[PDB]
Design a protein around this ligand. Structure first.
Ligand SMILES: *[C@@H]1O[C@H](CO)[C@@H](O[C@@H]2O[C@H](CO)[C@@H](O[C@@H]3O[C@H](CO)[C@@H](O)[C@H](O)[C@@H]3O)[C@H](O)[C@H]2NC(C)=O)[C@H](O)[C@H]1NC(C)=O
Ligand SMILES: *[C@@H]1O[C@H](CO)[C@@H](O[C@@H]2O[C@H](CO)[C@@H](O)[C@H](O)[C@H]2NC(C)=O)[C@H](O)[C@H]1NC(C)=O
Ligand SMILES: *[C@@H]1O[C@H](CO)[C@@H](O)[C@H](O)[C@H]1NC(C)=O
Ligand SMILES: *[C@@H]1O[C@H](CO)[C@@H](O)[C@H](O)[C@H]1NC(C)=O
Ligand SMILES: *[C@@H]1O[C@H](CO)[C@@H](O)[C@H](O)[C@H]1NC(C)=O
Ligand SMILES: *[C@@H]1O[C@H](CO)[C@@H](O)[C@H](O)[C@H]1NC(C)=O
Ligand SMILES: *[C@@H]1O[C@H](CO)[C@@H](O)[C@H](O)[C@H]1NC(C)=O
Lengths: 903, 6
């Protein structure tokens, strides 16, 4: 593949820059003779030549061209320019280009127009312009809809499909006369009959703002909607299948959307500039949602809400996903990343700001506290590997659509959010939002890199005369340009602090150099016997300060409420004082720091920085902990023990220990809910209740097993009167299936096939993977691959649910090794979250035998490659090596600890 | 896009 030719290189030339496009698309919603669903379109792109060139290189993916005046395209001049004749065109598949070879060169700073006529498949592939399907009674409904991000706009029409190639778009949709056409903007005049065939209408839309190609959306459906003008005058509509809308299932979204949009407009002092923001829920959708500017698309499951069958956790999902997509109207649409290597400027911001918007709409839920579990601790697992990557990867490394898709990962989302949470904490949100307002104003309708953000934050810092140990850029560059995070180790006898790059495996090999030497500039907050001390900045690898020195009974903890992106170790004397505090009165330690103490110590133990028994000792007080968060932090960390040990002699004592620790909590909830008749008022208490049930049942509390089997049996006896509160359904369904047999399984499967809401179906689909019968798991695996039984959007998610079951481990890994080409080609090998399957199937590996299989899997498939799962395979290899050594080193001490402490 | 935390 000759690298000297521009059309064989992945990045577009800088020689041409588009100005504006018109696009006409026409989906055919009934199959043709071939049984193929197709769309036909045309386009004109106007562009400026920035540097003289004899080739037009523009993106094109799976499009077929209708010849016009002897070629695939026609090239015309603008404002008097006179373009050369077209020599010939070619489609270059790897780089997804249409290449127009010219008989001469275009002229610098002149404009040109290029006309195309084309056709593509309206495939059920969830990418570009695609089809989604549902049933209304026995009538098949087919929807034309879109997903462009990252690199699929080019699959719908020829375009310069990179995010810094911003343009205006003039969209026309041609569609059956009975169906509604939607796009980013409002219709431009009324919808008129197609002259050649009045069975079709033609809907033209107003020109978009200047924007990136990946934000375009085109939808044709018979959906209904509810609507309300938001307090900032923007029209909000929630669109979904008619039955959902009539059932009122869009009403919650309508309650929160406009108010969140207005809240963000106010908080960032930057209006939303479009006349409307439609939210629309699609039956088939790859990701969770997509922030298309003016027409935000969602999985049905993440937009619709039924107050009589959806759980509180489902309700949290709706408001948080809406908040994230609305955050993007500012961070991503109005101001857009220059290139995908800086993705966190879109998604890290959306992941942080989503909590501010969700907290605005639901202030009693205290959602912002959950950032520590949902983001900080989530990303720290991968970011403690030598094979992690910086928040801002060098742009030169990110070239292919696979490499781009791969970056939609825990680093860009949750590390992005965590670093922003830290930043807002040390600046104050008042100062942070002032800098952000200036950033948004300056770069509106343009593109940014990470340096542009620091400049505007510096401006606010300078205006407020805030004194930092250096500039915003030099502090934040430490958290952005190098991977990883530090462990801060305190010696409370002398008050010394030291930092080093935290690695789960000390033996692992960091091959990525850092110009910052893996040293950070760290804002350190702290408490002494519960009282907050003065803040401190750690700039060097080591320092001394009496803030960190103790004597007598005093203890200190660093990182109050885990605002900072770092872990903390102490001398064992201070740890023993913390453990004493947890036994005396655990409420003296802020709840978030109770999660911290647990999660940090477990990770420190893996890294050989504290004995494993110290981390296990930190869970002893949980027997009297009622709060959601510290229990969730413990369960999260103990997940790793389950992965390492659930096929070993260690597992029984582990389960015995958890059964002892959770029983009083379970009994507390049994009494508090008046024998499961009620749910707690507070959302955190609701979540705590669900975990206590899940934990009690999984670890063999007999009252829990009886409760779930009894409830499930009562439902089977009364299928239309489900006695199980929505909050408990996931865990009751799973454990009833696990405790039961094929009769329970078949009932749940039938319920799943007959489901009317995605939420109920999702709970059943996860539950069916809880069977303990190998033959049932095998049969279920065969269903995941059948698009008539399990929608394609859900296939790999269900396979992951199977592999997480200890009996499905061998089954799924053997399946993955045996079917790699199929999974890669048909199940999203270059798309979002393909890493999820590699991660899930390999995370139990703790043996040389498994390692050798994984290395052989890498060798055997070198020709196919691993697409957007390439880094995940490297990380799987690193973790597997770490796990082998960790099991060797810990199995006997852990077995003895669980045995001695579970009685 | 929104992707649920794995
Ligand atoms: C997409 O639709 C937009 C909006 O209708 C089109 O923008 C319009 O384009 C015309 C023709 O190029 C612009 O005319 C220009 O006006 C000034 C005269 O004051 C002059 O400097 C230029 O020489 C040119 O004649 C017009 O301003 C503009 N209208 C708006 C509201 O921006 C655009 O052309 C369409 N793009 C495509 C590819 O069809
Ligand atoms: C650390 O986080 C805790 C827990 O969120 C904060 O405690 C809250 O404080 C607010 C304002 O004082 C009160 O309205 C609430 O009673 C507390 N909320 C909860 C959920 O407990 C605490 O303020 C934080 N500490 C610092 C220094 O910010
Ligand atoms: C595009 O062309 C190829 C090759 O002729 C053909 O197989 C395919 O069906 C065409 N696609 C559509 C949607 O017409
Ligand atoms: C189709 O065209 C007619 C006008 O000729 C219009 O009244 C009707 O609403 C159009 N339908 C849609 C769904 O756009
Ligand atoms: C939306 O708000 C209205 C008015 O406050 C309320 O009655 C209704 O229960 C809410 N709907 C949902 C689905 O939350
Ligand atoms: C800083 O102050 C200047 C001068 O008053 C003002 O123009 C600018 O908008 C301010 N910038 C920020 C980020 O507050
Ligand atoms: C864990 O607790 C026991 C006493 O309950 C103690 O013997 C042991 O040393 C503790 N482990 C560590 C590392 O402190």
């Amino acid at each position: 593949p000759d690298q000297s030719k521009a059309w064989n290189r992945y990045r577009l030339p800088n020689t041409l820059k588009p100005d504006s496009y018109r696009v006409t698309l026409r989906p055919y919603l009934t199959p043709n003779d071939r049984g193929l669903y197709v769309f036909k379109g045309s386009s004109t792109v106007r562009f400026t030549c920035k540097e003289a060139t004899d080739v037009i290189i523009i993106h094109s993916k799976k499009l077929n061209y209708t010849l016009s005046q002897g070629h695939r395209v026609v090239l015309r001049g603008v404002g008097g320019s006179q373009p050369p004749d077209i020599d010939k065109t070619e489609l270059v598949e790897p780089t997804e280009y249409l290449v127009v070879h010219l008989k001469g060169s275009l002229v610098k700073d002149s404009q040109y127009e290029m006309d195309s006529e084309f056709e593509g498949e309206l495939a059920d592939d969830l990418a570009g312009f695609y089809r989604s399907e549902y049933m209304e009674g026995n009538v098949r409904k087919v929807v034309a809809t879109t997903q462009m991000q990252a690199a699929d706009a080019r699959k719908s029409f020829p375009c310069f499909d990179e995010p810094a190639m911003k343009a205006e778009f003039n969209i026309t949709l041609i569609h059956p006369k009975d169906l509604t056409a939607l796009s980013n903007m409002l219709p431009k005049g009324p919808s008129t009959p197609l002259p050649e065939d009045p069975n079709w209408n033609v809907t033209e839309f107003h020109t978009t703002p200047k924007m990136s190609t990946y934000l375009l959306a085109f939808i044709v459906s018979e959906f209904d909607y509810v609507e309300k003008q938001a307090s900032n005058g923007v029209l909000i509509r929630i669109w979904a299948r008619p039955s959902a809308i009539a059932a009122g299932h869009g009403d919650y979204a309508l309650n929160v959307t406009g108010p969140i949009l207005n809240f963000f407009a106010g908080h960032y002092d930057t209006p939303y500039p479009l006349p409307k923001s439609d939210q629309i829920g699609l039956p088939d959708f790859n990701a969770g949602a997509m922030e298309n500017w003016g027409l935000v698309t969602y999985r049905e499951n993440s937009l619709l809400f039924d107050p009589l069958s959806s759980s509180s956790s489902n309700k949290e999902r709706v408001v948080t996903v809406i908040a994230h997509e609305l955050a993007h109207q500012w961070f991503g649409n109005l101001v857009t990343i220059e290139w995908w290597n800086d993705l966190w400027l879109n998604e890290g911001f959306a992941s942080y700001v989503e909590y501010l918007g969700a907290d605005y709409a639901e202030p009693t839920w205290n959602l912002k506290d959950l950032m520590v579990l949902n983001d900080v601790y989530r990303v720290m697992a991968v970011d403690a590997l030598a094979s992690s990557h910086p928040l801002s990867t060098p742009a030169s490394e990110i070239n292919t659509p696979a490499q781009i898709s791969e970056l939609f990962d825990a680093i860009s989302y949750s590390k992005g959010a965590s670093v922003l949470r830290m930043l807002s904490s040390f600046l104050s949100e008042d100062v942070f939002k002032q800098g952000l307002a200036s950033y948004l104003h300056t770069f509106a309708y343009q593109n940014t890199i990470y340096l542009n953000l620091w400049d505007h934050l510096q401006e606010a810092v300078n205006n407020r005369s805030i004194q930092l140990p250096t500039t915003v850029r030099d502090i934040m560059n430490r958290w952005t340009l190098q991977m990883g995070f530090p462990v801060i180790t305190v010696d409370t006898s002398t008050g010394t602090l030291s930092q080093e790059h935290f690695l789960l495996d000390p033996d692992s090999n960091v091959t990525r150099p850092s110009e910052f030497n893996y040293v950070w500039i760290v804002p350190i907050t702290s408490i002494r016997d519960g009282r907050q001390q003065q803040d401190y900045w750690l700039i060097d690898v080591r320092a001394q300060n009496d803030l960190f020195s103790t004597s007598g009974n005093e203890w200190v903890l660093l990182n109050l409420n885990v605002t900072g992106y770092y872990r903390v170790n102490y001398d064992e004397e201070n740890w023993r004082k913390i453990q004493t505090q947890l036994q005396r009165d655990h409420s003296a330690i802020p709840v978030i720091n109770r999660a911290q103490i647990i999660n940090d110590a477990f990770n420190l133990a893996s890294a050989h920085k504290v004995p494993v028994t110290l981390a296990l000792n930190n869970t002893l007080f949980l027997i009297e902990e009622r709060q959601y968060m510290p229990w969730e932090a413990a369960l999260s960390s103990l997940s790793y023990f389950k992965l390492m040990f659930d096929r070993s002699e260690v597992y029984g004592p582990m389960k015995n220990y958890l059964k002892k620790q959770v029983t009083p909590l379970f009994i507390h909830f049994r009494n508090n809910t008046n024998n499961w008749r009620e749910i707690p008022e507070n959302l955190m208490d609701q979540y705590s209740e669900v975990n206590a049930i899940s934990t009690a049942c999984s670890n063999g509390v007999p009252e829990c097993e009886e409760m779930v089997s009894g409830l499930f049996k009562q439902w089977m006896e009364n299928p239309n009167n489900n006695p199980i509160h929505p909050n408990l359904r996931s865990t009751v369904y799973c454990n009833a299936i696990a405790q039961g047999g094929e009769e329970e399984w078949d009932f749940a499967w039938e319920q799943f096939r007959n489901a009317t809401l995605v939420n109920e179906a999702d709970k059943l689909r996860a539950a069916l993977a809880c069977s303990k019968e190998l033959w049932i798991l095998n049969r279920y695996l065969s269903y995941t691959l059948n698009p008539d039984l399990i929608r394609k959007q859900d296939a790999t998610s269900t396979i992951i649910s199977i592999t997480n079951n200890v009996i499905g481990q061998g089954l799924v890994w053997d399946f993955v090794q045996s079917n790699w080409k199929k999974l890669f080609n048909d199940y999203g090998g270059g798309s979002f979250s393909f890493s999820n399957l590699i991660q899930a199937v390999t995370r139990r590996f703790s043996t040389e035998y498994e390692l050798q299989q994984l290395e052989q899997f890498k060798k055997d498939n070198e020709e196919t490659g691993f697409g957007s799962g390439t880094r995940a395979l490297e990380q799987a290899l690193e973790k597997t090596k770490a796990n082998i050594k960790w099991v060797k080193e810990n199995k006997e001490v852990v077995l003895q600890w669980f045995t001695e402490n579970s009685k | 896009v929104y992707i649920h935390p794995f």
